């Protein structure tokens, strides 16, 4: 597999519903949904070490991890968490998250490379799955 690339979003589903679960009020939900239409992902993969840069028009953030080794990032709504990524198959990985402080919904994410050259990202909070699809730039 090689997730490496510059990915641009073509589709985003259930993002507002995910943010609702996470407690975001309606006006900021709509504003966040609009910002997601400029969501871009840059990935550099070497073996099972990943460097990922998530960006929108006004914000950018870097996630660095190795499969099977705990690291710290933040949940979608911004709370700090501890994460662990594992492979599910040749071209799909899953991340489980645990809040560093307090309680909240159970969150996770996945990344998948399809046979058609798309990148599929999902983000989950409890019952609600947001799916976002990307192509290479
Ligand atoms: C492997 C990919 C990961 C861990 C992606 C993480 C992406 C996010 C936490 C995205 C968050 C967003 C918002 C909270 C509002 C603006 C739109 C997004 C999708 C960039």
UniProtKB/Swiss-Prot annotation:
GO annotation, cellular component aspect: cytoplasm; cytosol; endoplasmic reticulum; extracellular exosome; nucleoplasm; nucleus
Name listed for the protein in its UniProt record: Cellular retinoic acid-binding protein 2
Keywords noted in UniProt: Cytoplasm, Endoplasmic reticulum, Isopeptide bond, Nucleus, Retinol-binding, Transport, Ubl conjugation, Vitamin A
PROSITE patterns to which the protein is assigned, alphabetical: FABP
Function: Transports retinoic acid to the nucleus. Regulates the access of retinoic acid to the nuclear retinoic acid receptors.
Protein origin, superkingdom: Eukaryota
Biological source species: Homo sapiens
Cross-link (Glycyl lysine isopeptide (Lys-Gly) (interchain with G-Cter in SUMO)): 101
Positions annotated to bind all-trans-retinoate: 132-134
Comment block on domains: Forms a beta-barrel structure that accommodates hydrophobic ligands in its interior.
Family classification: Belongs to the calycin superfamily. Fatty-acid binding protein (FABP) family.
Gene: CRABP2
Cellular compartment(s): Cytoplasm; Endoplasmic reticulum; Nucleus
Oligomeric and partner information: Interacts with RXR and RARA. Interacts with importin alpha.
Predominant subcellular localization, coarse grouping: cytoplasm
UniProt GO MF annotations: cyclin binding; fatty acid binding; retinal binding; retinoic acid binding; retinoid binding; retinol binding
GO BP of this protein: embryonic forelimb morphogenesis; epidermis development; fatty acid transport; positive regulation of collateral sprouting; regulation of DNA-templated transcription; retinoic acid metabolic process; signal transduction
Pfam families in the record: Lipocalin (PF00061)
Residue window of motif Nuclear localization signal: 20-30
Resulting phenotype, residue 30 to A: Loss of ligand-induced nuclear import
Induction remarks: By retinoic acid.
Modifications the protein undergoes after translation, according to the UniProt entry: Sumoylated in response to retinoic acid binding, sumoylation is critical for dissociation from ER and subsequent nuclear translocation.
């Amino acid at each position: 597999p090689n997730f490496s690339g510059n990915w641009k979003i073509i589709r985003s589903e259930n993002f507002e519903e995910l943010l609702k679960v996470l407690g975001v009020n309606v006006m900021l939900r709509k504003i966040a949904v609009a910002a997601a239409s400029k969501y871009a992902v840059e990935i550099k993969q070497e073996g099972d070490t990943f460097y990922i840069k998530v960006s929108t028009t006004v914000y950018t953030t870097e996630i660095n991890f190795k499969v099977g080794e705990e690291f710290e990032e933040q949940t979608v709504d911004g709370r700090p968490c501890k994460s662990l990524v594992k492979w599910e198959s040749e071209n799909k990985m899953v991340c489980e998250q645990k809040l560093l402080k307090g309680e909240g919904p159970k969150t996770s994410w996945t990344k998948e490379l399809t046979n058609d050259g798309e990148l599929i990202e999902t983000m989950t909070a409890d019952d609600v799955v947001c799916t976002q699809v990307f192509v290479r730039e």
